[PDB]
Structure formats: structure tokens, C-alpha cells
């Protein structure tokens, strides 16, 4: 029984640059079957990632437990995915089009984070 903002996709910030695929699976996979992980690999995205769970209840669990999580000298910031936030970096026009397309086609919530 769970809040509308919870989601299988977790956005992660303050991630060490050196972190390996195996370590990502280790850390996140503890809470259950991982669908896929995407790690930022450009100047503007490094230090961030999206982790995707197969099941939403595992994702709630990971999200409840992993924010503030110490790996290396760092404390991870982990948030539920939010399309509005996710497409921030697009200029005012393109963001509007992209959001309208995901809502039309997939029915995803398109408002900014609650």
C-alpha cells in the first residue's frame, strides 16, 4: 500500500566516479532483481545514475534504505524518478514537447517533484 511518487526507477546523485558495474549491482541489487542501471558518463551527468528495479516494492525498500548510504567518502542521495526533473536540462520548449510525448504515449506523471 504506497504513495504516488514511489516508482521502480531511482535517481541517484553523489555517486563516486570510479564506481564499477559490479559494485552498483552489489549495492542496489540487495533489495531485489535489478532491471537495468544507467550511469552518467558525460561532464554534465557524471556522479549520477538511474537504477531500475523489476518490482516496485523492492524499489520502495531500496529507496527507504539507501539514501544517506555511505560508499567511499560519500553519502548517496537517492530519489524516486520524476520525468519533470529528469528532463530539466532541455530548454523551455523541448522539455515541454518531450513531457507531452511521455504523457500521451505512456501516461507518466509529468508535474515537478512533490
Amino acid at each position: 500500500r504506497l504513495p504516488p511518487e514511489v516508482n521502480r526507477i531511482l535517481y541517484i546523485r553523489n555517486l563516486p566516479y570510479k564506481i564499477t558495474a559490479e559494485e552498483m549491482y552489489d549495492i542496489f541489487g540487495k533489495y531485489g532483481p535489478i532491471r537495468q542501471i544507467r550511469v552518467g558518463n558525460t561532464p554534465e551527468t557524471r556522479g549520477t545514475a538511474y537504477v531500475v528495479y523489476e518490482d516496485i516494492f523492492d524499489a520502495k525498500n531500496a529507496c527507504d534504505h539507501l539514501s544517506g548510504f555511505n560508499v567511499c567518502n560519500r553519502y548517496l542521495v537517492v530519489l524516486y524518478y520524476n520525468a519533470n526533473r529528469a528532463f530539466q536540462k532541455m530548454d523551455t520548449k523541448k522539455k515541454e514537447e518531450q513531457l507531452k510525448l511521455l504523457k500521451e504515449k505512456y501516461g507518466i506523471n509529468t508535474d515537478p517533484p512533490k
Binding site: 526507477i9 542501471i37 544507467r38
Partner: protein, 39 residues
């Protein structure tokens, strides 16, 4: 026949089936801004 509260439980059930529904890679790929590598 389901009382008001167990109808709510039934609706919660339907709601999460939709929120826990399997996603294609195409659904998934569209969720994402540039600059990420798939592990």
C-alpha cells in the same frame, strides 16, 4: 458483496498492478535524458 473498504482494497490492488506492470525496453528508453550508459 464487497463492503466500501474492501472495494478500496480491491482498487489499491488494481492500481499497483498497473504501477508494477512489466516495461518494454522502448517504454524504458524513453524515460531517460542523454548522457547515460547502460550497464
Amino acid at each position: 458483496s464487497m463492503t466500501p473498504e474492501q472495494l478500496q482494497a480491491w482498487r489499491w490492488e488494481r492500481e499497483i498492478d498497473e504501477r508494477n506492470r512489466p516495461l518494454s525496453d522502448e517504454e524504458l528508453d524513453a524515460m531517460f535524458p542523454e548522457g547515460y550508459k547502460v550497464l
